[PDB]
Design a protein around this nucleic acid. Structure first.
Lengths: 79, 67, 41, 98, 138, 157, 154, 48
RNA sequence: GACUCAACACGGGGAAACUCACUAGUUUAAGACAUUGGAUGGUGAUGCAUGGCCGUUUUUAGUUCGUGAAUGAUUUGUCUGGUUAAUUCCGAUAACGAACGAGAUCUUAACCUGCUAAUUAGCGGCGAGUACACUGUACUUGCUGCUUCUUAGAGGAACAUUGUGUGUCUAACACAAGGAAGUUUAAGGCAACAACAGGUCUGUGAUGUCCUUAGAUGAACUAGGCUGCACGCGUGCUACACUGAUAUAUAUAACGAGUAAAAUAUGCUUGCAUACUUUUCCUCCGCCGAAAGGCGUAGGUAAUCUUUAUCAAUAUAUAUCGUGAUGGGGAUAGAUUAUUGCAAUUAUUAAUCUUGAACGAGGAAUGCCUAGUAAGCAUGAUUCAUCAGAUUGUGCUGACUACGUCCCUGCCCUUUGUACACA
């Protein structure tokens, strides 16, 4: 199962909008993010989805991602 | 123990300029060379100063090929 | 093999060789005559 | 006031600054404290693959810690340390009275 | 009055406090006789004879021992006591006898005043021994 | 409440992260300082926590990645480091280079001190790799900073 | 042999001025005569230490322990059963495995400490946590030392 | 899944992402394989 | 995987659950992008595609350039000879002059600067003495003259130094002495020119190419194997004993290294959900039990607490025996109690008792060895939830000797012969 909630999607999206600089972490079994009260497991697939949609870019590192929002993603993802 | 071309050329370079300062005493030769030269390695400075002393004792009793 | 017994210079080895006995009973005989290695008295 | 670092020249220069400031300010300042140096030793081996003559290297890191004591206001000494300190040096402040 | 000297050979270190008194030379608490090995007691006793009992009768020497090998500690003790007697001769009791004392000391032996530099060299890589290698096969 | 040794270990790993991040992002310019563009770098660092050999090597790595001739690229960067002022420079390129046979070419100019702790102090190192059609190419850049003064040099007026 | 010439001036003011082994034997004999403490019975089936792995074969080992514990207690002002074990450490030859050190049994030293506490020779205080000899025990050992000293003197 | 905080499966290397041959001295939790080259950047000089 | 040096206590490889590339199985989509098409990952192969790294030739002494000179590959310099830490120098020299390697350079230890001072250390003093000497001693409790002593912040000291000698009287080495430092004072690290088609793509989201992807070569979970044995081969530990086996007491160090979890109560009916400190290191103590270990605590994120005014042993001395495979020797198995681990069975580890194998110093053969070094004895760190018989470091006991050579073997140079050049 593990169906992704619409509330979770909108919450993470508005978190991206309000912060702008997000560290997603490579690990997925970590139960929670220090600055995000959401299970981490629901983050990396949607980050990969946005990256493959070419709206965001990632430098990537070992055990680190360092996603930074592009100038052409907020207008599309606002609603 | 011997020495290298660096010490040989250093010895040839020195004395030709401040021979009158240099004397026959090994310790005073060391002291003079200490401020004559500018190389900051104390061990090889002492080595080359001993070289100056042993070259200076070769003076005044025959040809020395230099200075 | 050992064949010494206990039934009939005071140094242990010498008296042991003389009496053909073990050195423990030789020490016992030494103490008996007088009355771990030490210098000669 | 104690300080800790790795490189010796940095701690030497800031210690010289400390004694100069103490002499200028004329405080009840204790004598210089010279703690023994600590060497931190680790072992490693070259040749990431097991092939070849297995050889090992020794890596040492040298700590440097010193102490002093002063009788003055904390604000002035901490401002002096801030203006005349290196971000690579760490300092703790402990005061004395008599 | 009182003087302090040091003596260092091998790992062991030794101090020597030379003070006036009635002849109280104590190795901390235990005397210079209860150490147990008479073989090293002979080396402890060696410096005293070449100086004289009467000189040491007027001095009290405090001896502090802090760890080390059996031979290293006694050698460091000898270094410490030699430095202490030399310093106290040069300072308080008598200078004229100090010259003859150091003369006879250097005549008899050299390690009595200044110790050796020999020490455990850091064993290299290659074998269990310091300069040994593991057995190699073909 | 952290011990000093473990604190310095943490500082070291953090600075290792910092240096690898600098290598990853700093691409368009040389060494222009460090922070103890800039706004986003500071924001990302805060969120996560809570002449120049590198520049010359990066320039030549760009030159070889663009596909321009290797000989011309190395000659140009060598001219550049001489004109910057170093007595010499050594560039090593190892990999495929047009053949399945691995090869390497050496370029000799300058003093080229190669061993000793004075050599380590007075000479720095740069080493990188680049991706190509059939593998990777490794580049070693060695420049010796002009010499306090080198102990081997002896001269008296 | 046991007597050695002494060139320096002695004090003989405590137990530090006498040999450890001879004084330990003398005080063990004195305690045997006094019957101050028990054997004790429960300790007959137990060896001295785990490394020792067998009997002490001396039929006086407990009294030697009792005569050595207060000796070391005087030597070190504050110590404990762990320090006694470390001092009396021996070898544990684990068969083929190479030899290693091993501390002695701690319960026998604990029992000796209980016996000395009952005798009043030792007291416990929050300050100076390590075991120390009481004042009366210090006077008793002073008298005993000055007595055995004169015996071995003349 | 039974994630336990002890043993071989408790931790993993930060850089090489492989817990094998991890050295835990000083709680560095870094693999020796990467440490070979990270020894200079970490600031921990090799002298002798 | 790796097979002579240059594999076989190596892959830091001391594997009880994935772990782990293996086996018997079961699950998950966790296949991003616009049913369907379509991609990441891989301890999958290829180190004979690589990079980096490393081990060798090779810890030696060789390598190269500018100019000049002698159809050409090329030669010279880069060498007859003397010295050596080495083409290291002198020296004759179609060579002259240069660069690398050597050299040099630094940490440790080693003496001094009565420099520099005292925190977490030492030398001192006195407020009281615990008992004795006599007209302070071992030990405490409190403050502070002082910092050679515990320590380093820098510098110097050592340079065949001096003289008696060896030398083409130049380059060198010997004897004796001052001196801690006279083979560079010794142990270390950097290792050129260039190569192996040497090892590693199982260390990496470093890496090309080929291959797998829903019945995964991705990931997760249970169990098993790497530990099984007809056997063979390397590194090691214990011994074959009287300088020995066993107990008792004395004198003893340094490097060390050290803080996303327990328990409680509430509700439901021991388990789940919920909240309070941190239980998640070494630990001194007082006991419980020989012991393992446990109980409630002192200390410390650290010269303060473990612990270090001290952690070991070979010794030292007295005692049992007294060289009889014995009491040596401790393989083997049985009986067990405690900790480590949700898991010890293939008995992890372990206090105890019992069990009692070979082994009388080892054939052909073989390895290491020049002074705190051989050898023997111990001990800290590494991986560790637990476990060294491994590796590295530390310390102790301080030996038998050479003080040079090519006879064996392994390299270097010169000459010469080649029908070899993957040599």
């Amino acid at each position: 199962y593990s169906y992704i909630p619409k509330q979770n999607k909108k919450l993470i999206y508005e978190y991206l909008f309000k912060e702008g600089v997000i560290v997603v972490e490579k690990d997925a079994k970590i139960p929670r993010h220090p600055h995000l009260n959401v299970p981490n497991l629901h983050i990396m697939m949607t980050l990969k989805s946005l990256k493959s949609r070419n709206y965001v870019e990632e430098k990537y590192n070992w055990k680190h991602q360092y996603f930074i929002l592009n100038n052409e993603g907020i207008e599309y993802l606002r609603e | 123990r011997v020495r290298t071309k660096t010490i040989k050329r250093a010895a040839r370079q020195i004395v030709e300029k401040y021979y009158a300062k240099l004397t026959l005493d090994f310790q005073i030769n060391k002291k003079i060379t200490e401020e004559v030269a500018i190389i900051p390695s104390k061990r090889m400075k002492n080595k080359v100063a001993g070289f100056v002393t042993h070259l200076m004792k070769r003076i005044q009793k025959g040809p020395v090929r230099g200075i | 093999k050992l064949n010494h017994a206990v039934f009939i210079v005071i140094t242990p080895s010498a008296i042991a060789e003389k009496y053909k006995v073990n050195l423990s009973v030789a020490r016992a005989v030494i103490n008996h005559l007088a009355d771990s290695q030490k210098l000669y008295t | 006031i104690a300080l800790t670092s790795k490189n010796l020249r940095a701690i030497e220069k800031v210690c010289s600054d400390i004694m100069k400031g103490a002499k200028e300010k004329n405080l009840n300042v204790s004598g210089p404290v010279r703690l023994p140096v600590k060497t931190l030793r680790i072992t490693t081996r070259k040749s990431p693959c097991g092939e070849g003559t297995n050889t090992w290297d020794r890596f040492e890191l040298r700590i440097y810690k010193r102490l002093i004591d002063l009788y003055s206001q904390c604000e002035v000494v901490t401002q002096m340390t801030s203006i005349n300190i290196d971000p690579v040096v760490e300092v703790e402040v402990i005061i004395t009275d008599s | 009055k009182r003087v302090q000297t040091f003596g260092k050979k091998k790992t062991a270190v030794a101090v020597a406090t030379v003070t006036n008194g009635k002849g109280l030379i104590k190795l901390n608490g235990k005397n210079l006789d209860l150490v147990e090995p008479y073989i090293l007691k002979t080396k402890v006793y060696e410096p005293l004879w070449l100086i004289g009992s009467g000189k040491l009768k007027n001095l009290d020497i405090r001896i502090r021992v802090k760890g080390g090998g059996q031979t290293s500690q006694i050698y460091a003790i000898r270094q410490a006591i030699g430095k202490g007697i030399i310093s106290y001769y040069q300072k308080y009791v008598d200078e004229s006898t100090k010259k003859e004392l150091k003369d006879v000391l250097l005549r008899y032996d050299r390690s009595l005043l200044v110790g050796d530099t020999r020490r455990c060299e850091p064993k290299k890589f290659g074998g269990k021994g310091a300069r040994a290698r593991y057995q190699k096969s073909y | 409440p952290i011990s000093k040794k473990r604190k310095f270990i943490n500082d070291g790993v953090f600075q290792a992260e910092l240096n690898e991040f600098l290598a990853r992002i700093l691409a368009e310019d040389g060494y222009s300082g460090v922070e103890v563009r800039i706004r986003e770098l500071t924001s990302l660092v805060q969120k996560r926590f809570f002449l120049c050999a590198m520049a010359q090597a990066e320039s030549l790595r760009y030159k070889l990645l663009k596909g321009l001739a290797v000989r011309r690229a190395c000659y140009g960067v060598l001219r550049h480091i001489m004109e910057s002022g170093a007595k010499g420079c050594e560039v090593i390129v190892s990999g495929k280079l047009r053949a399945q046979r691995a090869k390497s070419m050496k370029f000799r100019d300058g003093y080229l001190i190669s061993t000793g702790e004075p050599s380590k102090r007075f000479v720095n190192t740069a080493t990188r790799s680049a991706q190509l059609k059939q593998g990777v190419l490794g580049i070693k850049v060695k420049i010796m900073l002009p010499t306090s003064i080198l102990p081997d040099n002896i001269s008296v007026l | 042999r046991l007597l050695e010439p002494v060139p320096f001036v002695k004090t003989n003011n405590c137990i530090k001025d006498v040999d450890a082994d001879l004084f330990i034997r003398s005080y063990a004999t004195h305690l045997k005569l006094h019957n101050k403490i028990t054997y004790p019975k429960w300790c007959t089936f137990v060896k001295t230490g785990k490394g020792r792995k067998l009997a002490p074969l001396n039929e006086d080992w407990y009294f030697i322990r009792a005569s050595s514990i207060l000796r070391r207690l005087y030597l070190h002002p504050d110590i404990g059963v762990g320090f006694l074990r470390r001092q009396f450490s021996s070898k544990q030859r684990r068969g083929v495995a190479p030899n290693h050190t091993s501390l002695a049994s701690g319960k026998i030293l604990r029992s000796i400490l209980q016996q000395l506490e009952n005798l009043g020779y030792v007291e416990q205080n929050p300050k100076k946590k390590g075991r120390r000899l009481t004042t009366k025990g210090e006077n008793a050992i002073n008298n005993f030392a000055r007595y055995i000293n004169k015996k071995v003197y003349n | 899944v039974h994630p336990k905080k002890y043993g071989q499966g408790s931790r993993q290397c930060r850089v090489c992402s492989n817990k094998h041959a991890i050295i835990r001295k000083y709680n560095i939790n870094i693999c020796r394989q990467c440490f070979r080259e990270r020894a200079d950047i970490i600031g921990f000089k090799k002298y002798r």
